[PDB]
Amino acid sequence: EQKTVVVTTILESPYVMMKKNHEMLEGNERYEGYCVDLAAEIAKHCGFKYKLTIVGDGKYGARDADTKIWNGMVGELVYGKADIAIAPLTITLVREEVIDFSKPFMSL
Amino acid sequence: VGDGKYGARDADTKIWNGMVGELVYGKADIAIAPLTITLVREEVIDFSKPFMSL
Amino acid sequence: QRKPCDTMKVGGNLDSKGYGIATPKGSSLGTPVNLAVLKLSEQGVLDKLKNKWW
Amino acid sequence: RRSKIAVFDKMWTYMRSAEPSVFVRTTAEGVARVRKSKGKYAYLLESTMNEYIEQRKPCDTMKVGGNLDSKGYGIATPKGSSLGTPVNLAVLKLSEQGVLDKLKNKWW
């Protein structure tokens, strides 16, 4: 059977924003914005349930050349903990070596 | 190659004609041309990340 | 488009870059997501969403 | 034909009902129809072609406006060929080092 899939994202505004009702509401309804609308569309296509979590350390991250640790969203994704990063994560050479990007959904 | 187009599907024969057909039938190793990326094409050939925007 | 709305943008773009969905290497999620992210681009839904927030 | 957002549809309804026929079936006919019509006629085409046609003689037209969408060209490889995966790195490594900008400037 299928199990719900974690999805990791960073607030960064207006991609993700806090609902003005988080004092009371529970679950995904805490969050709204362009990212959430895109998430629901992908979920409707692929047919998976998803649970949002805010990223643990607030940063996109890159490999530290000293410790070889990956921090950030890429840290939570590479070490097998997040499974998808729907985020404004910029494609750059050092990232393609460890994760796969779709074709780009926006240009800047 | 004598396409003049950039390859398209024939809806009748289902045969690929033009540029993309030469890759599907394996006549060449790699194509480098300004063919535009669209959903009909990924299902039968692979594209890099885009080298230009328009 | 945020108050006090006293800036203005000018001119072109000095470079180009793209955002993207990301998945772990070897995940089964990798191929269907890229198809969805192409399919949504052609139906215009993405620009409708952009207008819905900017 | 599938436009949204309640601006393009006015143009579509116009082109569906104007007389005489506003469309042309080859691009050089569109260029000629612009060039002869003393600026009373305008045409829509791929920006990369527009930005080249500007630079040829007679040098009598100019680009105006931004864009309506975004699309990109790409290298193509036959499915499952081992050659495809290093090219996907090569294209990235070139873009971050200015080569694909200098090669554009050289020719346009």
Side-chain angles (χ1 to χ4, degrees), chain C residues 10-41:
Chain C
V10 296
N13 302 330
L14 281 69
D15 67 344
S16 287
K17 301 186 295 267
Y19 297 173
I21 310 296
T23 47
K25 199 171 297 288
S27 181
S28 62
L29 290 173
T31 62
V33 166
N34 186 56
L35 294 174
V37 176
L38 293 187
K39 189 175 292 184
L40 291 172
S41 76

Side-chain angles (χ1 to χ4, degrees), chain D residues 31-42:
Chain D
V31 171
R33 198 165 185 181
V34 174
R35 281 188 154 129
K36 290 185 178 181
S37 307
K38 299 184 183 289
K40 207 176 183 75
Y41 185 93

